[PDB]
């Protein structure tokens, strides 16, 4: 977690475990499908609360609280997700997986664009972090992504 206090792990047996820095069973969730991609929402002055976003292999992305109670979103997907990455300040969400496409979403779940179609599974996609100065003025329209495909291509 971005607060440095919590830790979240997933198992292909369907178990999602949330622990503290002392590695104790703070929360356990049992599913029926393997767990591949997990992330923690970045801290934000507007939100200031951290939730765990996990992409299951039953064509769904789920939001989980600290206590383990689901937020009830359970957004459905056409394709099985593989990787989930959160942009800085928690504004965007880069989702990859089946159909060989790298897509962008809002944190709510609204589709915006797709980035690329690599004709093969994209194992890992990452976003470029940005640093803003004290009172800096800039549109910051530019965005950078790095993709890795299964064939062996590392594209930007």
């Amino acid at each position: 977690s971005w607060d440095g206090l919590y830790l979240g792990f997933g198992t292909m047996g369907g178990i999602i475990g949330i622990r503290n820095r002392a590695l104790e069973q703070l929360a356990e969730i049992q599913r029926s499908f393997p767990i591949w991609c997990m992330d923690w929402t970045p801290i934000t002055p507007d939100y200031q609360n951290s939730v765990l976003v996990v992409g299951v292999w039953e064509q769904s992305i789920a939001h989980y609280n600290i206590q383990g109670q689901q937020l009830g979103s359970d957004k459905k997907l056409t394709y099985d997700p593989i990787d989930i990455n959160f942009s800085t300040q928690g504004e965007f969400l880069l989702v990859s997986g089946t159909n060989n496409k790298c897509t962008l979403y809002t944190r709510e779940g609204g589709f915006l664009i797709d980035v690329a179609t690599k004709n093969d599974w994209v194992w890992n996609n990452k976003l470029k972090p940005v640093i803003k100065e004290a009172g800096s003025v800039a549109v910051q329209d530019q965005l950078h992504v790095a993709l890795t495909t299964n064939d062996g291509e590392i594209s930007m």
Partner: protein
């Protein structure tokens, strides 16, 4: 043909077609559709020696541009008659001839892939099965399962997972393909 494929509706149409075909052969023996229909009827009527004999005498004829298609069909039938027994070499010969004279046959490449898979040559069998699946565009299920199994046995788990996902999306009544190859590939991926 209609009498043969009409089933037990009349039970006398097939024999009348047999007499008509025999009379046609008496008047004109070199008519390829006539011999093909009589061979099909012999297949229907449990006859063993006569059907293979007719197929053989049809094989001797040189390729005529007017009656190619029927010839191909007969060749395919002969190939099937060769694949029903251990004589795989002659089946492969007929299959190679058919693929030499045609590049869009559906059952031919499926039979070739089955032979290659049974001879544990998985790369060529997978290629032939993939080409056959491409020919009949994403509708058949059995050859899809065969391709998934071949990919799983060849350590190509990504393609097997894709094929299993597609076939499960198409036909949800196939639980056999879910616990056999999809799970094994999923667990062997990482």
């Amino acid at each position: 043909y209609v009498f043969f494929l009409g089933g037990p509706r009349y039970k006398g149409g097939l024999e009348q077609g047999l007499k008509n075909l025999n009379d046609i052969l008496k008047t004109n023996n070199d008519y390829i559709p006539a011999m093909l229909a009589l061979a099909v009827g012999k297949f229907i009527q449990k006859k063993s020696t006569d059907a293979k004999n007719l197929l053989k005498l049809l094989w001797k004829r040189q390729y005529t541009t007017e009656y190619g298609e029927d010839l191909e069909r007969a060749w395919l039938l002969s190939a099937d008659s060769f694949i029903a027994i251990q004589k795989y070499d002659s089946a492969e010969e007929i299959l190679k001839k058919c693929l030499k004279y045609n590049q869009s046959c559906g059952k031919a490449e499926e039979y070739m892939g089955l032979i290659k898979e049974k001879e544990q040559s998985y790369v060529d069998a997978a290629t032939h099965y993939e080409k056959a699946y491409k020919l009949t565009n994403e509708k058949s299920a059995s050859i899809a399962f065969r391709l998934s199994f071949n990919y799983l046995k060849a350590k190509r788990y990504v393609d097997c997972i894709n094929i299993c996902k597609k076939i499960l999306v198409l036909f949800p009544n196939y639980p056999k393909i879910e616990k056999d190859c999809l799970e094994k590939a999923r667990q062997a991926l990482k």
